Design a protein around this ligand. Structure first.
Ligand code: CLA
Ligand code: CLA
Ligand code: CLA
Ligand code: CLA
Ligand SMILES: C=Cc1c(C)c2cc3nc(c4c5[nH]c(cc6nc(cc1[nH]2)C(C)=C6CC)c(C)c5C(=O)[C@@H]4C(=O)OC)[C@@H](CCC(=O)OC/C=C(\C)CCC[C@H](C)CCC[C@H](C)CCCC(C)C)[C@@H]3C
Ligand SMILES: CC(C)=CCC/C(C)=C\CC/C(C)=C/CC/C(C)=C/CC/C(C)=C/CC/C(C)=C/CC/C(C)=C/CC/C(C)=C/CC/C(C)=C/CC1=CC(=O)C(C)=C(C)C1=O
Ligand SMILES: CCCCCCCCCCCCCCCCCC(=O)OC[C@H](CO[C@@H]1O[C@H](CO)[C@H](O)[C@H](O)[C@H]1O)OC(=O)CCCCCCCCCCCCCCCCC
Ligand SMILES: CCCCCCCCCCCCCCCCCC(=O)OC[C@H](CO[C@@H]1O[C@H](CO)[C@H](O)[C@H](O)[C@H]1O)OC(=O)CCCCCCCCCCCCCCCCC
Ligand SMILES: CCCCCCCCCCCCCCCC(=O)OC[C@H](COP(=O)(O)OC[C@@H](O)CO)OC(=O)CCCCCCCCCCCCCCC
Ligand SMILES: CC1=C(/C=C/C(C)=C/C=C/C(C)=C/C=C/C=C(C)/C=C/C=C(C)/C=C/C2=C(C)CCCC2(C)C)C(C)(C)CCC1
Ligand SMILES: CC1=C(/C=C/C(C)=C/C=C/C(C)=C/C=C/C=C(C)/C=C/C=C(C)/C=C/C2=C(C)CCCC2(C)C)C(C)(C)CCC1
Ligand SMILES: [Fe+2]
Lengths: 301, 32, 69, 24, 480, 75, 27, 335, 35
């Protein structure tokens, strides 16, 4: 601010830059760049991490016999738990890397970056003179990122339970999470799946309808579906497009946040029983058997 | 009807032909 | 029009086969076409159900064993 | 080796990103 | 200018250039056939047709070449493992060379048709513009298709003026190229009836020539002409794609489920033969029949051909490979050298134990030594798991009947554990992975790869048919 | 003819005042009387397991499955 | 894997070259 | 009377005129295939969830009558013994006995086939309606993606497998069972085609949300476009870096993303139909086998898949009659 | 001559689209092709 006749303030808020920095960008760019650099470095080369303090060094670095799909940034060691573990607390850089400190560094910097990214979206909504709710829509993926990276560690009491920064790591986190919390049967994740499927559905319908209409719509959709279309006006249609995926992802992020605090999905085990009391199996308890397999195989111990 | 399966299949064929004829006659009658 | 197009012996020989482009009044033989559609559908269902063992015939065996017969 | 070719593909993708956002 | 995806649309209104591009595609396909045949013959290993057939060597075009009669080779070997004293003009190398020569000739014809695209044949005699009389062109081509189908069914498959086709016994032990007398009864529609193929081709060729004559002598009705846009080439393209992915689905299903047109000895065993224990049932029936005659277990199992035991092995199951497990089966479990023999597991008490075979789904499966009644009398603990009925505790012993290890008994817990882990896959076989540095992971058959490719292509061509039917029906709005 | 007019009019309510409850009662008798179990083959709560079979039923025959299911069920 | 490396190199090369020559033809 | 060139009126003309009337519901010629088939598919599913049981097919009690709720109710697939039999009411099994046919699980085949033909009829309805008002049938082409998914997962996948038993039963909990089944057996998450499909689906959801938010936020104050294309373009150029300068291409991209994702998913499930699956990386498998200390998230995923398989096959595949003793069931503490 | 011929047009945006698609498919499928 006010540096050299306010030239720095003029440049930060300047809209002539190819990428608008903005005062929220003042925090996003350093945070996001630090997270990006540390993530790239850790993915490319980082010693194996004890994701749990059992002293089993899980390895997620490419140089350590991994590929892009398998490579990941391992969550922080369960011994650390929720403790703040920057570089200056570890006895040495090797110890910091061995306990999974890069994961906390990346997660913290990245969460701050995405928050400041919502902030930049608002800033350029205001600068260009338009209605600032693109940040509200972006709050959905940010909410899910916080739920998987911050809220779930908080509820589970350890950053080892956060989603690994990888692809195979993401699948393992999802499998574990289904094992422990029955994500599939929780109404909020069900609503989120509905949100994502409907988002794809409405994206496809909107693209097709607008592409076909742009010869240089309402009647076609009206005759197609028997209840016709309530969103005859394009403004309402576009608000619906914004709202459906956004609130679906809001609700799945909230569902994950609730399971962080040990509020699992629907448990219909032994829901239906025989006259004598014998348990009659359903799809619910087959899902339960799958969950039992995932649970027992997770607990490496 | 050399086998029960063939008898049943032919019966199904005539039943489906009857259904098609019925829907055709219905659309014909309701057309005008 | 402009260029009449290249003239070759094979072109002249095969011209009558391409001289009837764009040409029958009414529905023509569409009813016979539909009859053949239905017959072919019935035949396809017959062979499908034979393959699927949903149409068991005494003569057929529907297994590799029929190779020895 | 395998890791080096993976890194080459990733940095090429990043270069494509940079060219697309800046080199219009 | 035309976009990258629309560029070929330039040849829509030029029938001569359409001939040129179709000729070029046909030349490319024939050249691929010839080059593939040459490559497969180069990498083929006909030393062992029993334990190392073509399907174990990941050969795609060789099964089709040998299905219709090409057994001999210019290299001095036949497909049955014998010596081809007289290979003749038509061999694997001969067929490949013929396909390459055809590819070159078709390329030259494509060039010629590209250059001289302004032939008067395509110009309408009365209108004076390039127009294709699609109904009559279809009549001509359907007449030709029916004539050739009848010729194939009555001269090639039947062996009247041809070699016949590949016919084999149900278990694919002894199969050869034989004349195939047509079967006109209901059994003609039995898919595993070779006579069905000949009868089909004869009847379909007769009806094809009849329909070609009809479409030549009968013009389309105006109502149908405008309904199907018969004057447009793109409706023809959409309908051709429709027929093409219908054929793709049918052929993929035939290959996957097996038939007389996809012999076991060429494309390998089917998944549902392993699932239903086809070869296991046959082997057990043969062994029981031999034992009923009074022969010993070793003698009874020695009569079982090694080929049958090889078929009774989950590695040959096409549904055990991986999407990216590239290469032939020989690069998976390894080239099969010999048959060890049937492993009978007897516990200390005296009961006979049978290993629960691996279902097709499971990649890793628990090793369970069951009883006659199906009770789990023994197993192997999951790695370093607590043992209650482990091989070490129950002390089951494995005795080998037939094969290399005939009349050999092992009581060592480690050896019995290894042989049980091997026997859960079916018949126990010896593989030399050092020859090809085999990875030890199963790989799919040419049957399975053909099915995968053709079902994927059938779905893609369903999308293509959808798109082209849209374009031809909606030509008015697609281009004002 | 339109939804507002047809549902607002009392003719719809009076004609459907004796039908909608009739259908609801028809379903209630269909379920309570046990006809649903008889027609749809759903076993009653007291007949999931028979005296011969004390585990989940399994059908093995592909073609001769009618008799197998007849045996597995109470019949 | 020599086969995999060759396939990846070819897949990187030929379509990139095709697109680039198309651009050179018409930018 | 009415036609191209003075064509006499025929029955077909009257039928076409009636079927295309602008009544409350467009029936059309494709209606004759859509309405019966779709109606019977929905009715079959509702009846199966309400009354018909799964006891004799899957050894499960999955219906409202038996005590299951909406989530756990389903129309279970036929038993593995039926293999790929279409299970007609008149077929060689359940020869006209509707009760036994329901008990055989043939109601799933009824629902699946009638729904396949209802989907075909609905695509044809899209084509017919697009032609009626002279618009490009891009919506039918878009719907080709869900039809591809359905044909791949409900028809092609069981056809490639041992029978209809392993098709996804029409139910919420049953579909979750199918999803976990793919996870445990096929490692369907690791399949690159599933990866492309999920990328497409999430990208389509992102496009939906972003397009809606921006069109609603770049609206003009108080025949002409209602939102500022230039403003949205500038906003995304200076926020993200890339923006859509053409509305036509933007909407076509929104069309293309989910369609491509679902089509790649369909191709991957076709591959899985033959067990052609990208289950494992052989290099990592051998590295882990030779080096016990080596461990990654991929090896952990393989272990979890093995756990799912071994702990679920006992009840999910009754036809196999698998009885795993407690000592052989894989466990984390047993590694 | 060539009465109906059109040079293919591939603007910069389409170029970057194709390059990104190819490189994304490469990074996705290399881990499996190498295996
Ligand atoms: C449907 C047609 C078909 C079928 C079934 C086969 C089947 C087979 N071939 Mg043949 N081949 C074909 C076409 C076909 N081929 C063509 C067109 C060529 C010319 C290039 C060849 C050239 C060829 C050679 C040179 C060799 C084979 C070999 C083999 C065998 C090993 C397995 C395999 O294919 O690799 C595994 C297959 C794959 C890994 C591909 C499947 C994975 C999918 C498609 C994704 C791949 C990613 C890629 C980017 C495509 C996706 C697009 C994306 C946008 C979605 C098997 C018998 C080998 C053999 O043993 O023969 C002696 C061998 O050496 N084939
Ligand atoms: C008999 C088969 C057949 C034929 C003759 C055509 C012919 C045509 N199609 Mg159709 N199409 C087909 C199948 C077919 N297609 C299938 C199966 C699909 C499903 C994907 C499509 C989807 C499709 C679309 C979506 C479009 C066309 C278009 C076109 C026109 C331009 C072709 C083009 O893109 O050139 C240029 C081609 C390229 C630049 C190649 C692109 C690279 C491909 C994707 C990968 C390369 C694969 C490899 C080299 C070939 C081996 C695969 C083979 C074994 C199948 C032309 C009239 C376009 C059209 O008419 O626009 C108005 C159009 O928009 N087609
Ligand atoms: C998703 C499915 C689908 C869709 C949307 C279309 C859409 C289209 N097709 Mg294609 N087609 C398909 C599947 C499909 N087709 C299949 C599977 C085949 C067989 C190979 C064809 C063969 C085909 C040809 C040959 C032609 C078209 C044409 C067309 C266009 C006009 C509509 C038409 O001809 O009626 C298509 C109507 C149907 C597919 C529905 C018929 C439903 C049948 C009669 C019911 C049978 C039920 C019976 C009991 C069988 C039960 C099976 C089993 C349970 C035993 C349109 C773009 C025409 C075209 O290009 O227009 C100019 C054209 O010439 N199609
Ligand atoms: C009109 C829409 C329509 C469509 C497309 C279908 C389609 C289907 N139904 Mg559904 N169904 C419908 C209406 C429809 N149904 C209605 C209105 C009812 C209430 C009665 C039903 C009740 C019903 C039941 C209860 C069942 C089906 C089943 C089926 C499937 C198998 C039908 C079959 O192959 O035999 C019918 C096929 C034909 C008759 C072939 C048609 C070809 C021609 C017209 C016949 C031959 C005519 C020719 C001139 C004579 C040849 C003589 C020759 C023998 C010598 C298939 C998916 C079965 C199924 O698969 O469920 C699992 C099943 O169980 N449907
Ligand atoms: C689970 C997700 C999902 C559902 C439920 C769904 C549903 C629908 N989408 C439609 C349309 C579309 N879908 C589209 C794109 C997409 N749709 C997607 C995903 C979905 N689409 C995705 C991911 C995309 C992106 C490609 C497009 C482009 C369209 C349309 O044009 C159309 C529309 O207008 O949208 C509103 C409608 C089809 C017309 C109809 O009633 O069927 C008629 C045929 C029937 C009913 C027979 C099929 C019956 C099937 C087999 C189910 C039978 C069994 C039960 C009814 C269901 C069991 C449920 C249990 C599993 C819980 C319907 C509302
Ligand atoms: C060491 C290192 C670096 C680590 C590597 C990291 C690693 C482990 C992972 C990365 C590997 C990787 C890339 C894997 C993913 C591969 C994968 C599966 C790819 C999918 C490939 C594929 C072909 C799938 C088919 C489906 C498909 C086509 C999906 C495309 C998805 C896609 C791009 C979606 C759109 C995304 C997006 C952000 C769009 C925003 C566009 C935008 C700004 C529009 C906004 C907008 C809206 C308006 O309304 C208006 C008006 C205007 C004007 C406007 O602008
Ligand atoms: C596609 C590109 C595949 C690149 C594979 C690279 C590689 O390592 O191959 C390596 C393999 C060769 O692999 C080698 O082969 C040797 C000789 O047999 C030995 O077997 C070696 O052990 C083996 O490594 O090359 C191929 O097989 C290429 C096959 C490609 C054609 C098959 C396609 C069939 C499926 C079609 C599906 C259509 C999908 C529609 C669109 C979606
Ligand atoms: C895209 C277009 C989408 C259009 C959708 C149209 C849906 C129509 C209704 C679908 C059901 C009709 C097809 C039934 C096929 C069937 O029952 O096959 C069942 C039978 C096979 O039956 C099997 O045979 C085996 C032989 O060893 C064993 O005996 C098995 O036990 C037995 O079940 O297959 C056939 O009838 C021939 C296949 C015909 C082609 C069907 C498509 C194949 C798809 C690829 C399969 C590999 C993966
Ligand atoms: C106890 C039953 C309770 C039912 C619920 C109560 C409400 C009443 C409902 C009655 C109907 C129930 C279903 C029958 C339950 C039942 O008991 O069926 C039994 C009966 C089979 O009887 P059989 O096989 O023993 O008879 C042999 C021959 O005489 C006739 O097949 O099936 C039929 O009625 C014919 C099938 C339906 C009609 C033909 C197929 C229709 C599809 C045609 C598609 C053509 C393609 C068109 C393309 C466009
Ligand atoms: C002229 C002539 C000659 C010669 C010739 C020749 C020698 C030729 C050759 C030719 C050839 C040599 C050809 C080749 C071809 C090939 C091809 C055509 C290929 C193709 C391929 C493809 C198409 C592929 C595809 C793919 C892949 C790669 C894999 C999978 C995926 C896909 C599918 C994409 C002479 C003088 C003697 C005589 C006269 C004639
Ligand atoms: C002939 C035939 C058939 C047919 C059948 C049918 C056609 C049926 C139908 C059926 C139906 C057609 C049914 C329906 C049902 C319905 C229901 C069951 C409903 C329910 C609903 C609900 C539960 C709701 C709820 C809600 C809530 C509370 C929230 C808010 C809103 C709402 C309202 C959404 C059978 C199978 C017999 C046999 C074979 C052949
Ligand atoms: Fe829009």
């Amino acid at each position: 601010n006010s540096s050299l006749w306010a030239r720095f303030c003029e440049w930060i808020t300047s809209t002539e830059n190819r990428l608008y920095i903005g005062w929220f960008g003042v925090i996003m760019i350093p945070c996001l760049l630090t997270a990006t650099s540390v993530f790239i470095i850790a993915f490319i080369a980082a010693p194996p991490v004890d994701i749990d303090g059992i002293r089993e060094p899980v390895s997620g670095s490419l140089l350590y016999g991994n590929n892009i799909i398998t490579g990941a940034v391992i969550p922080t060691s369960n011994a650390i738990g929720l403790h703040f573990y920057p570089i200056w607390e570890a006895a040495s850089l090797d110890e910091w890397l061995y306990n999974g400190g890069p994961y906390q560094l990346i997660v913290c910097h990245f969460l701050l970056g995405v928050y400041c990214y919502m902030g930049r979206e608002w800033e350029l909504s205001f600068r260009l003179g338009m209605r600032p709710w693109i940040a509200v829509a972006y709050s959905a993926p940010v909410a899910a990122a916080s739920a998987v990276f911050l809220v779930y560690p908080i509820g589970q009491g350890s950053f080892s339970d956060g989603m690994p920064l990888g692809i195979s790591g993401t699948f393992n986190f999802m499998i574990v999470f289904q094992a422990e919390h029955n994500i599939l049967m929780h109404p909020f994740h069900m609503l989120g799946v509905a949100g994502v499927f409907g988002g794809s559905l409405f994206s496809a319908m909107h693209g097709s309808l607008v592409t076909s209409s742009l010869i240089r719509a309402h009647g076609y959709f009206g005759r197609l579906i028997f209840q016709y279309a309530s969103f005859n006006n394009s403004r309402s249609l576009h608000f619906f497009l914004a709202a459906w995926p956004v609130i679906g992802i809001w609700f799945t992020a909230l569902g994950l946040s609730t399971m962080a605090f040990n509020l699992n999905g629907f448990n219909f085990n032994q829901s239906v029983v025989d006259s004598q009391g014998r348990v009659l199996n359903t799809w619910a308890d087959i899902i339960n058997r799958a969950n039992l397999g995932m649970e027992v195989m997770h607990e490496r111990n | 009807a050399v086998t029960p399966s063939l008898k049943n299949f032919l019966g199904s064929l005539i039943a489906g032909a009857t259904v098609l004829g019925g829907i055709a006659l219905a659309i014909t009658a309701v057309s005008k | 029009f402009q260029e009449p197009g290249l003239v070759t012996p094979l072109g002249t020989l095969l011209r009558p086969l391409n001289s009837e482009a764009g040409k029958l009044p009414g529905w023509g033989t569409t009813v016979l076409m539909a009859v053949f559609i239905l017959l072919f559908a019935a035949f396809l269902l017959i062979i499908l159900e034979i393959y699927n063992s949903s149409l068991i015939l005494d003569d057929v065996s529907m297994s590799w064993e029929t190779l020895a017969k | 080796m395998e890791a080096l070719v993976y890194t080459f593909l990733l940095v090429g993708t990043l270069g494509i990103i940079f060219f697309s956002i800046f080199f219009r | 200018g035309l976009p990258w995806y629309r560029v070929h649309t330039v040849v829509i209104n030029d029938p001569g250039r359409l001939i040129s591009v179709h000729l070029m595609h046909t030349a490319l396909v024939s050249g691929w056939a010839g080059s593939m045949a040459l490559f497969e013959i180069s990498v083929f290993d006909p030393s062992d047709p029993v334990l190392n057939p073509m399907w174990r060597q990941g050969m795609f075009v060789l099964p089709f070449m040998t299905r219709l009669g090409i057994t001999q080779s210019w290299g001095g070997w036949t497909i049955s493992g014998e010596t081809a004293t007289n290979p003749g003009i038509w061999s694997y190398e001969g067929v490949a060379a013929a396909h390459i020569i055809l590819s070159g000739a078709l390329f030259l014809a494509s060039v010629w048709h590209w250059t001289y695209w302004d032939l008067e044949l395509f110009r309408d005699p009365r209108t004076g513009k390039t127009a294709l009389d699609l109904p009559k062109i279809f009549g001509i081509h359907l007449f030709l298709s029916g004539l050739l189908c009848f010729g194939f069914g009555a001269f090639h498959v039947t062996g009247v003026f041809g070699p016949g086709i590949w016919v084999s016994d149900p278990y694919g032990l002894t199969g050869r190229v034989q004349p195939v007398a047509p079967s006109w009864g209901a059994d003609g529609f039995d898919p595993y009836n070779p006579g069905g193929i000949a009868s089909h081709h004869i009847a379909a060729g007769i009806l094809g020539v009849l329909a070609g004559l009809f479409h030549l002598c009968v013009r389309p009705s105006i109502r149908l002409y405008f309904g199907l846009s018969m004057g447009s080439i793109e409706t023809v393209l959409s309908s051709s794609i429709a027929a093409v992915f219908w054929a793709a689905f049918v052929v993929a299903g035939t290959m996957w489920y097996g038939s007389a047109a996809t012999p076991i000895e060429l494309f390998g065993p089917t998944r549902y033969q392993w699932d239903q224990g086809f070869f296991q049932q046959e082997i057990q029936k043969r062994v029981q029949a031999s034992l009923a005659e009074g022969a010993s277990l070793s003698d009874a199992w020695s009569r079982i051909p090694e080929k049958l035991a090889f078929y009774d092995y989950i590695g040959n199951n096409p549904a055990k490979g991986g999407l990216f497990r590239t290469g032939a089966m020989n690069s998976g479990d390894g080239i099969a050298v010999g048959w060890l023999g049937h492993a009978s597991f007897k516990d200390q008490e005296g009961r006979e134990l049978f290993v629960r075979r691996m279902p097709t789904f499971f990649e890793t499966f628990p090793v369970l030594l069951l009883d006659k009644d199906g009770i789990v009398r023994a197993d192997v603990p999951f790695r370093k798991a607590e043992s209650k009925y482990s091989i070490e505790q129950v002390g089951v012993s494995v005795t080998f009947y037939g094969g290399e290890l005939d009349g050999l008994t092992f009581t060592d817990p480690a050896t019995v554990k290894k042989y049980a882990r091997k026997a859960q896959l079916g018949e126990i076989f010896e593989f030399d992975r050092s020859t090809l540095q085999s990875d030890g992971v199963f790989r799919s058959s040419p049957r399975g790869w053909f099915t995968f490719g053709h079902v994927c292509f059938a779905l893609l061509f369903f999308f293509g048919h959808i798109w082209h039917g849209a374009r031809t029906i909606f030509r008015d709005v697609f281009a004002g | 003819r339109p939804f507002s007019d047809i549902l607002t009019s009392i003719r719809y309510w009076v004609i459907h005042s004796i039908t909608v409850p009739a259908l609801f009662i028809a379903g209630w008798l269909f379920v309570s009387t046990g006809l649903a179990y008889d027609v749809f083959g759903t076993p009653r709560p007291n007949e999931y397991f028979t005296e011969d079979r004390q585990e989940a039923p399994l059908i093995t025959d592909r073609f001769n499955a009618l008799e197998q299911v007849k045996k597995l069920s109470g019949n | 894997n020599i086969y995999g490396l060759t396939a990846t190199a070819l897949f990187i090369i030929i379509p990139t070259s095709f697109l680039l020559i198309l651009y050179v033809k018409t930018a | 009377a009415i036609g191209t060139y003075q064509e006499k009126r025929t029955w077909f003309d009257d039928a076409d005129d009636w079927l295309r009337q602008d009544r409350f519901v467009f029936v059309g010629w494709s209606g004759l295939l859509l309405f019966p088939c779709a109606y019977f598919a929905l009715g079959g599913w509702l009846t199966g969830t309400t009354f018909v049981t799964s006891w004799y097919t899957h050894g499960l009690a999955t219906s409202y009558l038996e005590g299951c709720n909406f989530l756990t109710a389903a129309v279970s697939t036929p038993a593995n013994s039926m293999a790929h039999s279409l299970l007609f009411v008149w077929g060689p099994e359940a020869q006209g006995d509707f009760t036994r046919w329901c008990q055989l699980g043939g109601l799933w085949a009824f629902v699946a086939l009638h729904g396949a033909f209802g989907l075909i009829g609905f695509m044809l309805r899209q084509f017919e309606i697009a032609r009626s008002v002279n618009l490009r049938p891009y919506n039918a082409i878009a719907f080709s993606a869900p039809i591809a998914v359905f044909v791949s997962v409900f028809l092609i996948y069981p056809l490639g497998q041992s029978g209809w038993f392993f098709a996804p039963s029409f139910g919420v909990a049953a579909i979750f069972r199918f999803i976990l089944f793919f996870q445990g057996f096929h490692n369907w998450t690791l399949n690159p085609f599933h990866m492309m499909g999920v990328a497409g689906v999430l990208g389509a959801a992102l496009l939906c949300a972003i397009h809606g938010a921006t069109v609603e936020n770049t609206l003009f104050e108080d025949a002409e476009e209602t939102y500022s294309m230039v403003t949205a373009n500038r906003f995304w150029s200076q926020i993200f870096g890339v923006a859509f300068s053409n509305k036509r291409w933007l909407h076509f991209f929104m069309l293309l993303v989910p369609v491509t994702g679902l089509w790649m998913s369909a191709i991957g499930v076709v591959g899985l139909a033959l067990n052609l699956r990208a289950y494992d990386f052989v290099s990592q498998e051998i590295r882990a086998a030779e080096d016990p200390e080596f461990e990654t998230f991929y090896t952990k995923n393989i272990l979890l898949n093995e756990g799912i398989r071994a702990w679920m096959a006992a009840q999910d595949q009754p036809h196999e009659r698998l009885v795993f003793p407690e000592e052989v069931l894989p466990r984390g503490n047993a590694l | 001559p060539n009465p109906n011929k059109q040079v293919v047009e591939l603007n910069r945006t389409s170029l970057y689209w194709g390059l990104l698609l190819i490189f994304v498919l490469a990074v996705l499928f290399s881990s499996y092709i190498f295996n």
